[PDB]
């Protein structure tokens, strides 16, 4: 019942005759799937789960440094050289100073300088592969004809919910069986092999900050990196070298990069952690769904014989259905809701379509909730619910 | 034109195995929730197990002890196995669909049933 | 499980009209359906009436039945001396797995 508010829905109706139905579960769509003599049934791809993520390359942004040291030379003597510069912690620079009798040089021209800084890291962040074996979706599947509101959000007790059920397909298990107790079972045959190449971007993970990002950003980001599992390489990104009177040389680092790529990565798509798996918000998964082994529940009950009581207002969705909630005092129950519209009160002739198929209610006790959904034609119409003169009926308008 | 019918062996040796079939005509075998039920001539009836097509395995919590039943989708029919017999449980045995929801036209189903003596 | 409950011996002439009672508990009767039988010896129970008050083709318009919050009850008009037997009311449970439980049993009595 998840998919009745929802802008991005979409209603299927397979070819007359045709075995096979095939649909698109997106992040934040719903799809609500009909077939003549087959019950309504939404299917969501509520969360995508990615397991077993592995290094692959760590950015650094913030540094820190200590231990400078330096050397000079006279001109045209060749350059200055230190031990460090063969020591990958430290990184150097060589430059072209004004030499003479005041800084002790007997020649005419530039002398070399050479200044190195020891390289730490405070602060860094890391770039981790998704494998699209090691991946995980997650499907909720959610029937109408009962549970009334107070089961849209409702995520403690779905051991015990016969009616609420979790999916999850994975490449290593595409196939899995849904219990729906009463409208039996539905297939769901999945490819996530052939829905959506998640191989071309990479997993980042900041200060407990996590983002998709593209693979074209992260390589291109100019900052110290190293790859895999420490050996960094381009250390000249972060460090200043200030230039001293052409006599010494100092380094500084550059401030924190947090924030620069924070405003940079407006535009990506985020993500969380739930302890080592990490959830996605986006991606979208084709299944094909079973229409034989999924049954109907209740076409052999009578109509409901006592008395309604419109308990809300009746509105309409985005999409031209009509719900209503209601009160059913009555103990026959089990009992199929009589529920249909009609444009003349005299004919009463049963115009348009269920949508939710053969709406029915499962309590013999009293004060029960129930919510059903209706399809009225173009135009015209009176939504008739219940039959007899204990009958309620409402007013409804189309276009 | 459904029609449910046991069949099995009537009289048996104590501490051997009550092996009885029943075989569904006319009817899918996926359609319902078949049992067998036992009564005592004087007692009352007695639910033995009921099994799903797809194996859904229930067993009577009084009669879970020594009582493994079978369910054949292909020959459209559904096995019973009791080992251990005593005496004591010389009843009438009878194979039915029972419906765990009632959610179909007609309702449970019966066949006409089998009384079955053990000897000692 | 509480132990159903029910008199012994039920008695009366032709013509009169005599109920049956079936108590149950919340596990059972307050989510499932009740159905009646009625017991001939030395044959299976047959169904007289199914999912509150459907009777297949065959079953006559004289038998009706009603289910409460924890009892059950059959009517029966019309009472013939042809229908002196054993009655019992089973009815699903919703306990461990789902148990068919059936009741304690009358016997019913023309004089």
């Known amino acids: 019942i998840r998919c009745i508010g929802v802008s991005n829905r979409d209603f299927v109706e397979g070819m007359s005759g045709g075995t096979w139905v095939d649909v698109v579960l997106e992040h934040g769509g719903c799809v609500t799937v009909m077939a003549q003599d087959k019950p309504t049934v939404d299917i969501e791809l509520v969360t995508t789960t990615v397991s077993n993520m592995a290094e692959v390359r760590s950015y650094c942004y913030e540094a820190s440094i200590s231990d400078m040291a330096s050397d000079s030379r006279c001109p045209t003597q060749g350059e200055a050289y230190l031990d460090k510069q063969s020591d990958t912690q430290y990184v150097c620079k060589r430059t072209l100073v004004d030499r003479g009798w005041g800084n002790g040089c007997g020649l005419f021209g530039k002398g070399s300088l050479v200044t190195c800084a020891k390289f730490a890291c405070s602060k860094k962040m890391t770039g981790k592969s998704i494998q699209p074996e090691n991946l995980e979706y997650r499907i909720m599947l959610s029937v109408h004809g009962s549970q009334h509101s107070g089961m849209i959000v409702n995520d403690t007790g779905h051991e015990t919910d016969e009616n609420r059920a979790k999916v999850e397909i994975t490449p290593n298990s595409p196939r899995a069986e849904a219990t729906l107790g009463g409208f039996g079972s539905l297939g769901l045959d999945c490819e996530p092999r052939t829905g959506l190449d998640f191989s071309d971007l990479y997993y980042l993970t900041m200060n407990n900050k996590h983002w998709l990002v593209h693979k074209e950003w992260f390589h291109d980001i100019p900052l110290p990196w190293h790859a895999g599992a420490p050996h960094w390489n381009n250390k000249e990104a972060l460090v200043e070298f200030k230039d001293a009177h052409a006599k010494r040389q100092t380094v500084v680092v550059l401030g924190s990069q947090e924030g620069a790529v924070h405003t940079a990565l407006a535009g990506a798509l985020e993500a969380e952690m739930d302890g080592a798996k990490g959830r996605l918000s986006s991606g979208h998964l084709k299944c094909r769904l079973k229409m034989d082994k999924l049954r109907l529940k209740g076409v052999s009950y009578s109509l409901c014989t006592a008395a309604f009581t419109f308990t809300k207002i009746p509105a309409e969705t985005l999409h031209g259905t009509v719900t209503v909630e209601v009160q059913y005092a009555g103990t026959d129950g089990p009992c199929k809701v009589p529920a249909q519209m009609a444009v003349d009160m005299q004919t009463l002739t049963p115009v348009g379509r269920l949508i939710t198929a053969n709406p029915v209610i499962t309590e013999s006790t009293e004060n029960s909730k129930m919510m059903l959904e209706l399809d009225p034609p173009f135009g015209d119409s009176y939504i008739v619910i219940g039959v007899g003169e204990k009958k309620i009926t409402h007013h409804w308008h189309r276009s | 034109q459904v029609h449910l019918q046991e069949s099995g062996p009537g009289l048996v040796r104590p501490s051997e195995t009550l092996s009885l079939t029943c075989t569904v005509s006319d009817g899918s075998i996926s359609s319902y929730y078949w049992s067998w039920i036992r009564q005592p001539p004087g007692k009352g009836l007695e639910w033995i197990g009921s099994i799903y097509y797809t194996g859904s395995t229930n067993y009577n919590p009084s009669l879970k002890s020594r009582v493994t039943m079978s369910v054949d989708t292909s020959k459209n029919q559904f096995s019973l196995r009791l080992n251990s017999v005593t005496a004591a449980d010389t009843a009438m045995y009878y194979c039915?669909?029972?419906?765990?929801?009632?959610?179909?036209?007609?309702?449970?189903?019966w066949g006409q049933g089998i009384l079955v003596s053990v000897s000692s | 499980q509480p132990v159903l409950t029910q008199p012994p011996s039920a008695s009366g002439t032709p013509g009169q009209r005599v109920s049956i009672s079936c108590s149950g508990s919340?596990?059972?009767?307050?989510?499932?359906?009740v159905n009646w039988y009625q017991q001939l010896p030395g044959t299976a129970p047959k169904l007289l009436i199914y999912?509150?008050?459907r009777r297949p083709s065959g079953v006559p318009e004289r038998f009706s039945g009603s289910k409460s919050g924890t009892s059950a009850s059959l009517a029966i008009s019309g009472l013939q001396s042809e229908d002196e037997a054993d009655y019992f009311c089973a009815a699903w449970d919703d306990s461990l797995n789902g148990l068919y439980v059936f009741g304690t049993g009358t016997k019913v009595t023309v004089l």
């Open positions: 919340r596990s059972n009767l307050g989510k499932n359906t």
């Open positions: 999912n509150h008050s």
């Open positions: 039915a669909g029972l419906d765990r929801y009632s959610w179909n036209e007609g309702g449970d189903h």
